Amino acid sequence: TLNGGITDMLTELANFEKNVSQAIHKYNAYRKAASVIAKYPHKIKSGAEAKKLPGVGTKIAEKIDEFLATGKLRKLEKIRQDDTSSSINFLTRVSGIGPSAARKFVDEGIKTLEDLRKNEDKLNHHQRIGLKYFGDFEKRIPREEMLQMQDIVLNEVKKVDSEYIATVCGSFRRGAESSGDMDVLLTHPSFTSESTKQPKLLHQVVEQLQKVHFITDTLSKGETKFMGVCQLPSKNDEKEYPHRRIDIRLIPKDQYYCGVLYFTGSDIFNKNMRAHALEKGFTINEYTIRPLGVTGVAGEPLPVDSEKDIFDYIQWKYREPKDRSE
DNA sequence: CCGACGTCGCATCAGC
DNA sequence: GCTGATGCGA
DNA sequence: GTCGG
Ligand SMILES: Nc1ccn([C@H]2C[C@H](O)[C@@H](COP(=O)(O)C(F)(F)P(=O)(O)OP(=O)(O)O)O2)c(=O)n1
Ligand SMILES: [Cl-]
Ligand SMILES: [Cl-]
Ligand SMILES: [Mg+2]
Ligand SMILES: [Mg+2]
Ligand code: NA
Numbered sequence: 001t002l003n004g005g006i007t008d009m010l011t012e013l014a015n016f017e018k019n020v021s022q023a024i025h026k027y028n029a030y031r032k033a034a035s036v037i038a039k040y041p042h043k044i045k046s047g048a049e050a051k052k053l054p055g056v057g058t059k060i061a062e063k064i065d066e067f068l069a070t071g072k073l074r075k076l077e078k079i080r081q082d083d084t085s086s087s088i089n090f091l092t093r094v095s096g097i098g099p100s101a102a103r104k105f106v107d108e109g110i111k112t113l114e115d116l117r118k119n120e121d122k123l124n125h126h127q128r129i130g131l132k133y134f135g136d137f138e139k140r141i142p143r144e145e146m147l148q149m150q151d152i153v154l155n156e157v158k159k160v161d162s163e164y165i166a167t168v169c170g171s172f173r174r175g176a177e178s179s180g181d182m183d184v185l186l187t188h189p190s191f192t193s194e195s196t197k198q199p200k201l202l203h204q205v206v207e208q209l210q211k212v213h214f215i216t217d218t219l220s221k222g223e224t225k226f227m228g229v230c231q232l233p234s235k236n237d238e239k240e241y242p243h244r245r246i247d248i249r250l251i252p253k254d255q256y257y258c259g260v261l262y263f264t265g266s267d268i269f270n271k272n273m274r275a276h277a278l279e280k281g282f283t284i285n286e287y288t289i290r291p292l293g294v295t296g297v298a299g300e301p302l303p304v305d306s307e308k309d310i311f312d313y314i315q316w317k318y319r320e321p322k323d324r325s326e
Numbered sequence: 327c328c329g330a331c332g333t334c335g336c337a338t339c340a341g342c
Numbered sequence: 343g344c345t346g347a348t349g350c351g352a
Numbered sequence: 353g354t355c356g357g
């Protein structure tokens with residue numbers, strides 16, 4: 001909140017470049033500049049003071065000067081007026097509707113919530129669910145509710161097979177007082193980088209969760225990644241809890257640390273970390289960290305026995321999950 | 327300057 | 343059917 | 353949009 005005004009501006013610009021301009025790299029650029037400024041311990045008084053921080057170039061320095069003086073940004077004042085941008089931005093807020101689909105819908109005349117509801121036939125499964133829970137999905141999840149959700153998921157997974165280990169990651173693992181959704185990392189001794197000794201490992205858990213009516217909808221589902229909707233049960237007369245987004249990722253047990261590092265995030269932290277890895281000559285994914293031999297081809301997975309080992313390989317002092325919120 | 331920018335799973339599609 | 347590329351998402 | 357070689 002120290003430099004909230006500036007970070008909010010940069011974020012709005014990031015969203016515009018991603019949704020409207022479909023320029024994913026410009027989006028990352030703003031996201032980064034925004035991230036760095038957010039951690040800066042001082043109240044920025046000029047664009048020059050900001051350009052010092054890495055990720056902030058000249059263009060963003062000027063905008064900051066504009067924002068400090070005027071308290072707003074003309075570039076954004078305009079984007080806000082443009083109907084197509086306003087429309088594309090709104091549509092993208094529906095889960096399942098990205099920049100491409102949004103721009104398309106706008107071409108066909110579909111640019112509002114009402115339009116979406118009277119044209120459900122033009123939406124695929126995912127998009128139809130996003131429309132359905134449009135309201136609920138924008139609501140944050142209190143940590144208290146996250147704890148109830150954790151209890152249900154872990155206790156149900158245990159009932160399916162005691163060898164399953166379920167770990168809630170994401171912002172929750174980073175200590176956040178509220179989350180956008182629930183991200184669950186799952187492991188079972190019967191699924192390793194060596195072999196899949198048992199099929200449907202992910203399926204059965206999803207199955208069980210649907211059985212107790214915790215998971216209510218499915219946006220997508222494969223052998224290792226599930227993306228759906230869930231809801232905490234309510235008591236007598238008690239109003240129902242909002243529907244929430246839940247993601248479950250099945251990861252080879254022996255590659256748990258690379259997995260938990262990946263799933264804990266944040267997204268920007270992971271991107272910055274992976275970038276640093278490359279600068280140091282390593283490549284990291286949710287399964288392992290590997291070296292980059294001259295040519296470029298990734299080498300063999302290095303040994304990993306802790307999240308810390310990963311950090312060491314790239315000469316980065318370890319950072320608690322709570323300090324990985326960039 | 328200038329081509330890179332983290333990495334990958336699922337859904338959907340085009341070309342065969 | 344498959345593979346390879348695009349869209350959307352983690 | 354930024355930047356390092
Ligand atoms: N582009 C991305 C997106 C995600 N992630 C990893 C790292 C993320 O921490 C993790 C979860 O994805 P999430 O989409 O639930 C998230 F990011 F929003 P979370 O941090 O959980 O915040 P919230 O509470 O709002 O959900 O996937 C990643 O590596 N790259
Ligand atoms: Cl771009
Ligand atoms: Cl790998
Ligand atoms: Mg999350
Ligand atoms: Mg998630
Ligand atoms: Na800079």
Ligand code: NA
Nearest residue numbers: 092094095097
């Ligand atoms: Na969307």
